[PDB]
Amino acid sequence: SPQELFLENVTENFNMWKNDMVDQMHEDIISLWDQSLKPCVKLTPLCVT
Amino acid sequence: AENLWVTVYYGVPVWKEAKTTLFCASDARAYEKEVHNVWATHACVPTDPSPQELFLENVTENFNMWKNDMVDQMHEDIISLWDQSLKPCVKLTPLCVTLICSNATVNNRTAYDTRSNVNVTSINNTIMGEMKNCSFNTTTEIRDKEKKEYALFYKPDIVPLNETSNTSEYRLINCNTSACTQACPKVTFEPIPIHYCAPAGYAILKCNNETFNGTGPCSNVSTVQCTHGIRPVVSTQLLLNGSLAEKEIVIRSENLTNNAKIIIVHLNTSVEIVCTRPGNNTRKSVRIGPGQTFYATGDIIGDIRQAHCNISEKQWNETLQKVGKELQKHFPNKTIKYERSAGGDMEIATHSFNCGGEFFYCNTSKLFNGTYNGTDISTITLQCRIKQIINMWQGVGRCMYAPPIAGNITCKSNITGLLLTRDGGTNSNKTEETFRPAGGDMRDNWRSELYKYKVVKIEPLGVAPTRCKRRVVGRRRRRR
Amino acid sequence: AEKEIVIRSENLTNNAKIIIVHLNTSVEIVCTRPGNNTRKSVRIGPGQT
Amino acid sequence: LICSNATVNNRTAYDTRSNVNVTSINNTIMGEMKNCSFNTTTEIRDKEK
Amino acid sequence: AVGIGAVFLGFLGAAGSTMGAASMTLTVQARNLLSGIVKLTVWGIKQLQARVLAVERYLRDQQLLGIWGCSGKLICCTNVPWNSSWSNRNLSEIWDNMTWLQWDKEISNYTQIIYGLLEESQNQQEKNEQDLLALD
Amino acid sequence: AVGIGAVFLGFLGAAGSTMGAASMTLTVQARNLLSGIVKLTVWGIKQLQARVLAVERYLRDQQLLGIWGCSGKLICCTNVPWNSSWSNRNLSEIWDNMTWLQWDKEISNYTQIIYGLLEESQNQQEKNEQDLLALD
Amino acid sequence: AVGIGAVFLGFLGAAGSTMGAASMTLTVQARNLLSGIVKLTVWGIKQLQARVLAVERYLRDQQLLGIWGCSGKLICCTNVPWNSSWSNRNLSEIWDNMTWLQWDKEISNYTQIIYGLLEESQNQQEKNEQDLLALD
Amino acid sequence: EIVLTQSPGTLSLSPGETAIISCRTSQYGSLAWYQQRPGQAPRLVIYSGSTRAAGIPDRFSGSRWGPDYNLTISNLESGDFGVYYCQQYEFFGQGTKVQVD
Ligand SMILES: *[C@@H]1O[C@H](CO)[C@@H](O[C@@H]2O[C@H](CO)[C@@H](O[C@@H]3O[C@H](CO[C@H]4O[C@H](CO)[C@@H](O)[C@H](O)[C@@H]4O)[C@@H](O)[C@H](O[C@H]4O[C@H](CO)[C@@H](O)[C@H](O)[C@@H]4O)[C@@H]3O)[C@H](O)[C@H]2NC(C)=O)[C@H](O)[C@H]1NC(C)=O
Ligand SMILES: *[C@@H]1O[C@H](CO)[C@@H](O[C@@H]2O[C@H](CO)[C@@H](O[C@@H]3O[C@H](CO)[C@@H](O)[C@H](O)[C@@H]3O)[C@H](O)[C@H]2NC(C)=O)[C@H](O)[C@H]1NC(C)=O
Ligand SMILES: *[C@@H]1O[C@H](CO)[C@@H](O[C@@H]2O[C@H](CO)[C@@H](O[C@@H]3O[C@H](CO)[C@@H](O)[C@H](O)[C@@H]3O)[C@H](O)[C@H]2NC(C)=O)[C@H](O)[C@H]1NC(C)=O
Ligand SMILES: *[C@@H]1O[C@H](CO)[C@@H](O[C@@H]2O[C@H](CO)[C@@H](O[C@@H]3O[C@H](CO)[C@@H](O)[C@H](O)[C@@H]3O)[C@H](O)[C@H]2NC(C)=O)[C@H](O)[C@H]1NC(C)=O
Ligand SMILES: *[C@@H]1O[C@H](CO)[C@@H](O[C@@H]2O[C@H](CO)[C@@H](O[C@@H]3O[C@H](CO)[C@@H](O)[C@H](O)[C@@H]3O)[C@H](O)[C@H]2NC(C)=O)[C@H](O)[C@H]1NC(C)=O
Ligand SMILES: *[C@@H]1O[C@H](CO)[C@@H](O[C@@H]2O[C@H](CO)[C@@H](O)[C@H](O)[C@H]2NC(C)=O)[C@H](O)[C@H]1NC(C)=O
Ligand SMILES: *[C@@H]1O[C@H](CO)[C@@H](O[C@@H]2O[C@H](CO)[C@@H](O)[C@H](O)[C@H]2NC(C)=O)[C@H](O)[C@H]1NC(C)=O
Ligand SMILES: *[C@@H]1O[C@H](CO)[C@@H](O)[C@H](O)[C@H]1NC(C)=O
Ligand SMILES: *[C@@H]1O[C@H](CO)[C@@H](O)[C@H](O)[C@H]1NC(C)=O
Ligand SMILES: *[C@@H]1O[C@H](CO)[C@@H](O)[C@H](O)[C@H]1NC(C)=O
C-alpha cells in the first residue's frame, strides 16, 4: 500500500538517467535468474552428433 | 560508612585480553570486486588503512608472539579465500586419459651459456631435457569424436612405472589420489598488502621496543586502529618481501635449547635476489567439453638452457656472517657451521616461491655451505626446477594446476629473514655448531610480522569510591 | 511417564487419527547382525572410493 | 550388473550343530544376498576392470 | 577519581595516568565504543556478527546504567554506601597513584555485589518517590 | 499495583500473584529481555535474525518510553488523566486480585488511545518547559 | 524555531513549512526512523545489513544526544552560547520563513564546532554538579 | 654437554620399602622419569618435574629446584621394579636398576 502524502511547498530536482534504482533492478533480476536456474538440468549429455 | 560511597563511571580506559574476528582492510585501492581478483576482491573490504598511532604514557604490557592467535586467523582466512576462489574454476578430470610421451625436439635454437647452437637436449640440459612431449586422445565438444592433441609437461607432473616399466605410458600424478582444478585466468592474484583493523570495542596494541625477543614485558607501547601492510607471501627456507629490524639481526625462538623448535632470524639489511625463466613459452589452448578450455605449454621458442636465481656474493656472505655472530652470542664459546638442507619433501628440501603465477623450486646447497661464523675464506647461481601441479599448502588435500605463463618471466625480491633448525643428539663437543635451513608452516612466516601486535577488548564500565552521596552529603578522604 | 501407561489422540472415535501409547516401564530389546562383514573398497573416478 | 548366487567357504551355522551345506537351507544373510560382478572405469578413463 | 574531560585525544591515549587524570577521557571512549569502523562470499556473516556483538555490548552496558538511575550521564553519583565488608581500601593510592588498568584488578572478585546493591537502592528510591507523589 | 522490587528470582517466577504482588520483577524482567543467550552452514542467518529481532524489540520499547518522558526508569508516573470514556474499571481487583496476565486482557481494545494521549501530553509539557526557561 | 508538537501526519508531510511550524512533527519522524518495515538465497544478508545499519545510525544519534545531556527529550535547551565567530545569522528568516530543508544548508560548514562545544560544556557542568554534591 | 646423570646405578630393595633415585641435570630444562618393565616397552611415569603421568598411583613422586632432582617410590610393589631412566628434551640418563630381594 503506497499511502501517498503530499507536501506543501517542497521543490526537488529529479534525474531519470542517473536513477540508480534501475541498476538495482538490473542486479536483482540477474541474481534471481542465475540463482533460480542453477539447480536445474544440464544439457551437456545432449551434445551428441 | 559515613564518608564512603560508590560511584559509577563509564567510558573508563580499561581493557582485557579477549579474542575476536578482525576486519580485512585492503591497500586502498587496487580491487575490482567481480571483474578480477588481485587478492581478495570478492571478499575483503577496500577501506582506508591509516594506522594513526598513539603513544601511551606509562603502560607496560606482556606480549607473546607464539600464542598470537592472529596468525591462526590469517591461516583460516587464507585457506577460505583460496578454497572459495578455486571452486568455480575448471576441473581437470577429463584430462586423465592415458598419455604417450617422448623426448622433446628443438628446431635449431641457441644457448645462453655457450657460444654455439643447440645440438642435443641431454647436454643442453635445462627446461629442455626435463620436459616430456606428450600426446593423448581427448574428447571433443560433441562427445562422439576424438582427436590427437599434444602438449609439453614438466617431468614431475607425470608418473610412469605404474604403467609398467616398458610401456612409455604416463598419467597425471594427481589422479592417484584426487582431481585437480585449474586456476581461473582472470582470478590471478598476487601479494597485495593487507591491513587488519579491530572491530568496534577492540583495540590493537603494538610494542615499539623492537629489540625484545618475542615474549615478556614491553614498555614502549602504542595503540593502532589498523595494522601496517602485511604481505601474504608464502615461501620456504627464506622469507622475502618482508620488513626489517631497526637494530642489527634479530633471532627469536621460544627455547633455543629446545632444538626441535624453529629459529626465525630477522635481518636488518635486505639481500637482493633475482629469479628468471628465460625462453618464450607459447601458451597452447586445447578444448575440453562444451565450454571449458585447458591451457598447456606448446613449443618453447628462443634460447632455452636456463632456469636460474642470482644472489650477490659478498652481500649474502656478510649477512650470513652477522647471523653467525649473533648465534655465537646466544651459544657462547662455540663456532657456527651452516650446512645443506636436512632432507624431506621437495617443497621444503628446496626454496619455494611463486613469480607471475609460476611456482619455482630451487636447490639451496650453494647457499648454506658455510663454516665458522660465516662462509669459508661475483654472483651465486641457484639451479631451479618448476612444477605446474601444486598441493596447496604443504600437505593439505586441495590440489591445483597452474596454467603456464607465456614469454620470459623475471621477478625481484628482498630477502629479509631465514628459517633454521638445529642438529639434535650429542656428541656435545662436535654438535652445537651445526645449523640447517628448514621448512616452515605459513604461521612461521606470518609470526615474523605479527609478533608486534596484541588484541584486547575494552571494558568501558568501572566503579570507584568518590566524594558524593546522591543528593545528600559529601566526604572526608585521603591523599597521596 | 510417571503414572502408568498413557494413550493420546485428538479423538479416539476418529479412527483414522493415530493413537500414541506412552509406557511407564521400558522393555529391553537387543538386535544383532552376526558374522564379520569385510569392507571391500573399490575405486571410482580420480579420487572417489 | 551380472549376478549369481553366493558361495560359502566352509563356515558354520549358529542355529544348528552342523557345518554349512547349502545357502537355500542355511537361509539367512547368505541366500538373501546376491554376488554381482560388473565392469567399472578405472581412474584413467581408458581402462576397465 | 575525577577530572575535567576532553575529547581531542582520539582514542585510548590515557591509560597510564592515575584515575583522577584518566577520568578526563570518558567522552572519547564512550564515542569510539560503538562508532565505526564502517562472487558469493560469506564474510558478510562475519561482519554482521561483529557489528551485532558490539551493539549488544553497548546495549547491555546502557541497560545496566539505566537500571541504576545513571543513564544519560558518564559520571554518576549513587546512594549505595561502601559496604561493611571493606572499610579498608587504599584511597591515598586511588586518588593520584593507581591508573584504572591497575585499580580494575583490586575491585575484581567483589564487583558482583555492587550491581545488586545499586539495583536494590534504586528500586527503593523509585518506590519512595512514588510514595511521596501519592500524598499530594 | 506497586511494591518493593527484587532480582534474586532469576526469571518470571511471578506471574500468578496480584499486580501489587507481581510488579516487583521489573529489574530481572528488564535484564533477561535482551541479555543472552550467547562445512559451510546457513544457521548464522537464523541466529542473526533472532538477535536483530530481539534488539529491535528492545529499541522500540525504549523509544516508546522515551517519547513519554519515561526513559531512564522502570516505574513512571505521568500526567494523562484517566480517560473520559472509561471512568468505570474494577480497581478493587486491580490492587490485590488481578494478576498482570489477567489485567492485560482488560486494557486491550483501548491501549492504542493511551499512547497517543501520553505523546500529546508529553509534547505539551516539553514546549511549556521550554517556554518557561525562555521566559526570563 | 519551535511549535506545539503533533503525531497525526503519519510521515514527513511537513517539510516545506517554516521551522516554527515544521518543528511540530518531531514525534513522527522520531518514530518512523527505526520502526518497521518488518531454496538457498542470500538476500537475508541484504535484509540484515539494512536492519543493522538502521539500528547503528539510531544508536549513534542517541549516543550523541546522550553526551550533550539531551537523551530523553526531542527538544533540548543547552548552555553553549551562540558562537563568537557567527554573531550574524538571519534569525528574522529563521523564525517564520526558512524551512528546515533550507536552514540545514546554512548551518553546514560549522556544525563540527558545535558537536565539540556541546560536549565540552556538558562535561564541565557534570563535574561542577559532582563537586557541588561533594561539597556537603 | 653431559645434560643428564643418574645415581645410584644399582639398588637392592625389599617389597614394601621406599626407593630413592637421583638425577642431576646440568642445564635448565624439563625433567622426567621412566619405568622399564623388564622385557617390555618402557612407559612414562613423571614429567615436568613433579607432575605424575596418567594412571600412576601416588607411590610415585619427586621434586627439584635447579640442578638436582630426587625421585622417591613409597611402598614399591613387586611388579613396580625395573630400570628407571632420566630424560631431558633428547638425552637419556645412564639408568638405575632396582631389584627385588
Ligand atoms: C616482491 O616484491 C617485488 C617488488 O619489489 C614484486 O615484483 C613484482 O612482481 C610482479 C609479479 O609477481 C610483477 O608484475 C608483472 O609485471 C609485468 C611487467 O610490468 C612492467 O611492464 C608493463 C608492460 O609490460 C607495464 O605496464 C608495468 O607498469 C611495468 O612497467 C607485467 O607485464 C605483468 O602483467 C601481468 O599481470 C597483471 C596483473 O595480474 C595483469 O593485469 C596483466 O594483464 C598481465 O597478465 C605483471 O603485472 C611486477 O612487475 C614486479 N615489480 C617489480 C618492480 O619488479 C614481487 O612480485 C614480490 N613478490 C615476490 C614473491 O617476489
Ligand atoms: C645470473 O648469473 C649468471 C652467471 O653469472 C649469468 O649468466 C650469464 O648469462 C649471459 C647471458 O644472459 C651469458 O652471456 C653470454 O656469454 C657468452 C660467453 O660465455 C658470450 O659468447 C655470449 O655472447 C653471451 O654474452 C654469460 O655467459 C653467462 N655467464 C656464465 C658464467 O655462464 C646470468 O645472466 C645472470 N642472470 C640471470 C637472469 O640468470
Ligand atoms: C642439490 O644439488 C646438489 C648438487 O647437484 C645435489 O648433491 C648430490 O646429491 C646426490 C644425492 O644425494 C649425491 O649422490 C651421492 O653421490 C655419492 C658419491 O659422491 C654416492 O656414493 C651416493 O650413493 C649418492 O649417489 C651427490 O653426491 C651429490 N653431489 C654433490 C656435488 O653434492 C643435492 O642432492 C641437491 N639437493 C636437492 C635438495 O635438490
Ligand atoms: C667470522 O667470519 C668473518 C668472515 O666470514 C671474519 O671476518 C672477515 O670478514 C671479511 C668480510 O666478509 C672477510 O673479507 C672478505 O672475504 C670474502 C671471502 O669469505 C671475500 O669474498 C671478500 O671479498 C672479502 O675479502 C675477511 O676475510 C674475514 N677475515 C678472516 C680472517 O677470514 C671474522 O674474523 C670471523 N669471526 C671471527 C671471530 O674470527
Ligand atoms: C536371541 O534369541 C535366540 C533364541 O533364544 C538365541 O538363539 C541361540 O543362539 C545360540 C548362539 O548364540 C545358539 O547356541 C547353539 O546351540 C546349539 C544347540 O542348538 C549348540 O549345539 C551350539 O553349540 C550353540 O550353543 C542357540 O541354539 C540359539 N537358540 C535357538 C533356539 O536357536 C540368540 O542367541 C539370542 N541372541 C541374539 C543376539 O540373537
Ligand atoms: C611434440 O610432439 C608433437 C607431436 O608429435 C609435435 O608436433 C608435430 O610435429 C611434426 C614434426 O615433428 C609435425 O609434422 C606435426 O604437424 C606436428 N603436429 C602434430 C599434431 O603432429 C611437436 O613438434 C613436438 N614438439 C617438440 C618441442 O618436440
Ligand atoms: C563373488 O564373486 C566373485 C567373482 O566371481 C568371487 O571372486 C572370485 O572367486 C574365485 C573362486 O570362486 C577366485 O578364483 C577369484 O580369484 C575371485 N576373484 C575374482 C576377481 O574373480 C567371490 O569369491 C564370490 N564370493 C562369494 C561369497 O561367492
Ligand atoms: C639443427 O642444425 C643442425 C646443423 O645445422 C642440423 O643438422 C639439424 O638438422 C638442425 N635441426 C635439428 C632439429 O637439430
Ligand atoms: C662448500 O664449501 C667448501 C669450503 O671448503 C668448498 O670446498 C666446496 O667446494 C663447497 N661446495 C659447494 C657445493 O659449494
Ligand atoms: C565344505 O565342506 C564339505 C565337507 O567337508 C566339502 O564337501 C565342500 O567341498 C566344502 N566347501 C564348500 C564350498 O562346500
Numbering used by the authors:
A (entry chain I): 80 to 128
B (entry chain E): 31 to 144, 144b, 144c, 144d, 144e, 144f, 144g, 144h, ...
C (entry chain A): 266 to 309, 312 to 316
D (entry chain A): 129 to 144, 144b, 144c, 144d, 144e, 144f, 144g, 144h, ...
E (entry chain F), F (entry chain B), G (entry chain J): 512 to 549, 567 to 664
H (entry chain H): 1 to 30, 33 to 91, 96 to 107
Original paper wording:
The HIV-1 Env is a trimer of gp120-gp41 heterodimers that are heavily shielded from the host immune systems by N-linked glycosylation and further protected from neutralization by conformational masking and considerable sequence variability. A glycosylated region near the base of the third variable loop (V3) of HIV-1 Env forms a supersite of vulnerability that is targeted by antibodies originating from diverse germline genes in multiple HIV-1 infected individuals. Here, we determine structures of antibodies in complex with HIV-1 Envelope for all observed members and ancestral states of the broadly neutralizing HIV-1 V3-glycan targeting DH270 antibody clonal B cell lineage. Here we used cryo-EM to visualize the interactions of a complete inferred DH270 clonal tree with the co-evolving virus Env.
Based on these two early intermediate resistance features, we selected Envs from days 358 and 526, having both G300 and long hypervariable V1 loops of 18 and 28 amino acids, respectively, and Envs from days 836 and 949, having both N300 and short hypervariable V1 loops of 11 amino acids, to identify structural hurdles to DH270 antibody interaction. Despite poor sequence similarity, examination of the V1 loop regions of each unliganded Env structure demonstrated a structurally conserved hydrophobic core and variable hydrogen bonding and/or salt bridge formation that ensures coupling of the V1 loop to the V3 GDIR/K motif. The d526 Env contained a similar hydrophobic core and displayed more order despite its longer length. This was due to direct V1 loop interaction with the nearby N332-glycan. Visual inspection of the V3 GDIR/K motif in the G300-containing d358 and d526 Env maps suggested greater disorder in the broken sheet structure compared to that of the N300-containing d836 and d949 Env maps.
